[PDB]
């Protein structure tokens, strides 16, 4: 019962959100992980990304 | 910045006034009851709802928007 209140959100930055804190800035679309770049570093050791070089 | 020095713009909400809705009938003695404001042919609400006749148009309040019944 809501013709209003909706907008096309199939593309762009507002189409999706980070699965950590719903942030729209600095998000990673690569490899299907959808982690923002500030929270990716705190959980990089948990995923398996390490610093060799 | 946001002190809101705009004009009056008097707006309010709805009312939903509690008038005597079910005081509109035509009851006789011994023993029949003749119901005014005849119903609709809606197959979802079977013989329970009524219709409001305003001006050459009878509207169903149970259904939401568009069901045209005339008399």
């Amino acid at each position: 019962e809501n013709v209003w209140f909706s907008h096309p959100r199939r593309y762009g930055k507002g189409s999706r959100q980070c699965r950590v804190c719903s942030s729209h800035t600095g998000l990673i679309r690569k490899y299907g992980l959808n982690i923002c770049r500030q929270c990716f570093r705190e959980k990089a050791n948990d995923i398996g990304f390490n610093k060799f070089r | 910045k946001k002190v809101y020095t705009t004009p009056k713009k008097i707006k309010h909400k709805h009312k939903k006034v509690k008038l005597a809705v079910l005081s509109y009938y035509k009851v006789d003695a011994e023993g029949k009851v003749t119901k005014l404001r005849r119903e609709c042919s809606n197959p979802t609400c079977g013989a329970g709802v009524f219709l409001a006749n305003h001006k050459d148009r009878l509207y169903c309040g149970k259904c939401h928007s568009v069901y045209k019944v005339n008399a």
Binding site: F5, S6, R19, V20, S22 | -
Partner: protein, 96 residues
Amino acid sequence: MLMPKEDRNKIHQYLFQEGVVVAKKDFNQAKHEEIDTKNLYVIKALQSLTSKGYVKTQFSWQYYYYTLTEEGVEYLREYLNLPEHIVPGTYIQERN
């Protein structure tokens, strides 16, 4: 929250027989897993329950992992009018 009696009775029936109700924090969805009602009708139903006890709430990565407590067993028993000696979820089937 103002919601009809058909939507609320589908929540507490599913809450008692399962114990765990999850709901991702995402609105204008209205169709989600294993519950016919909207995503908004699930979250604000149990958020009304948190301030009187009866349930435990953890946030968990925008997904709202909920946990029924032992005090909410008596409240849903009176609400659904289910008889006693039937407590689903707590008793294990065979060993573990």
